[PDB]
Structure 1
Amino acid sequence: GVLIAFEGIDGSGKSSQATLLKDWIELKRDVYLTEWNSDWIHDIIKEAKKKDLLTPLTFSLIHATDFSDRYERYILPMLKSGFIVISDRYIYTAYARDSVRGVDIDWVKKLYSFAIKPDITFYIRVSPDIALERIKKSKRKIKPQEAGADIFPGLSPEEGFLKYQGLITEVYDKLVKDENFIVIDGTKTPKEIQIQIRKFVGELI
């Protein structure tokens, strides 16, 4: 059982490369792909608390709660069954998104220590500037979570994305050495990068 994690700023190419790589493993091996889509516990609590301003701390516990249920209901059982699990975003998303709002990152690390470290974590390194260009063409609505609208209320969605995804990057780069991140340069072509992905993974043998 091997767990491979993708992380990087939003619009950095995470899911697009995650789905092409699940199309590759699926021909040869058991593979299961997950995104942080969050799940039902985040939905209940957010709706119940739509009126109040909750603290980053409480937001942090809500996401970890919802992740803990996916982790022990799907992720961990499939790694016990031998599957490869591809996580489109893993616990290092929570490290950044909650530590950037003043939650003690070492407390977040302890919070998530119930989770196995990925066999490999692909850090797709892309500038916020270059990555913002792609969501403009995709016709997507720019979610407030993506712009850090809670932290940057005065800015426009566009302007908030640039500043928020920047501090996200600093936390990611801070994790590179301690977390054995492998940094992939997301500047490149989807396929060009994709063949870098398939080489690194294959090494497992």
Structure 2
Amino acid sequence: DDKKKGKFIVFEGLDRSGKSTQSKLLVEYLKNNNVEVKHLYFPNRETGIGQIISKYLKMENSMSNETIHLLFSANRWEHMNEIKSLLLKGIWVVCDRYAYSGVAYSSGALNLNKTWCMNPDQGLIKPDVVFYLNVPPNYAQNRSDYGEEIYEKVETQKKIYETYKHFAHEDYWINIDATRKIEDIHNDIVKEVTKIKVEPEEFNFLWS
């Protein structure tokens, strides 16, 4: 028996838009209602690949557009095992950033070619739902530690914001106004996650 028992939820969004904050809250909420959950995020900067992705973002190095893109996708693929497993077991996975981030950022910030960009992530496990913490490009420039990494320039974030729309109208995509109080965002999130039916199912894969 291999059906998919856990639930896989992804947060997406501009930089400094509260992805962590909201993923932590969703996690603790679920912990509270007795649902085993594992928090992951992407990129995972601890693996070999991650380490390279990391220097790239911190501008400790440079690499061509297509290399870093590929590196990002690879990084997700090295977690498909863990994820299938948790999900097989009934552990929900709350993830922050996934392939959506890949296409969005590469195609927006590095003028890559949307189909080209999706291609390598194609076949990755599809999540049950994506929460897009929607915020205006200039909004987050105020937050905590903005500007400390390669893509954290208003002009660039404006470019990215437009590419996120490439999923904006997709059934699993759930826009969320993220310019509000933390607990307002949190509650919308919960209301939507309760709508969910649990029930073992079959896995689905990007980009269906």
Q: Which residue is equivalent to 2:104?
A: 96
Distance 1:179 1:61, change over 3 A: farther
2:141 matched to 1:132?
Answer: yes
The offset of 1:7, in angstroms, is 0.3
Whichever structure has more helix as a proportion of its residues is: 1
Deviation track 1:93-132 (CA, whole Å, cap 9, x = no partner) reads: 1011111213221122221112122111001110122211
Do the aligned residues in 1 keep the contact of 2:7 with 2:92 (CA within 8 Å)?
Answer: yes
Question: For residue 24 of structure 1, what is the aligned residue in structure 2?
Answer: 29
Question: What is the 5 A alignment of 1:186-205?
Answer: 186-205=178-197
Q: 1:47 to 1:82 in 2, by over 3 A?
A: closer
Distance 1:194 1:126, change over 3 A: same
CA shift at 1:45, angstroms?
Answer: 4.2
Aligned to 1:146, the other structure's residue is in SS state coil
Moved over 3 A (4+): 43-53
Aligned equivalents of 1:163, 1:172: Cα separation in 2:
15
Matched, 1:7 2:7: no
SS in 2 for 1:129: coil
- Match for residue 81 of structure 1? 89
What is the TM-score when the length of structure 2 is the normalising length? 0.81
Look up the equivalent residue of 2:129 and give its one-letter code.
I
Task: Name the SS of the counterpart of 2:169 in structure 1.
Answer: coil
- TM-score, scaled to structure 1: 0.82
Where do 5+ consecutive residues of structure 2 fail to align? 1-5, 198-208
1:112 and 2:121 aligned: yes
Aligned to 1:142: 147
Residues 45 and 54, structure 2, Cα contact 8 Å, conserved in 1: no
Q: Aligned partners of 2:156, 2:87: CA distance in 1, in Å?
A: 33
RMSD: 2.3
Residue deviations 1:19-75, cap 9 Å, x none? 011001112101111122323122454699999742110111111112211222x22
SS of 1:182's partner is strand
Q: What letter matches 1:30 in structure 2? A: E
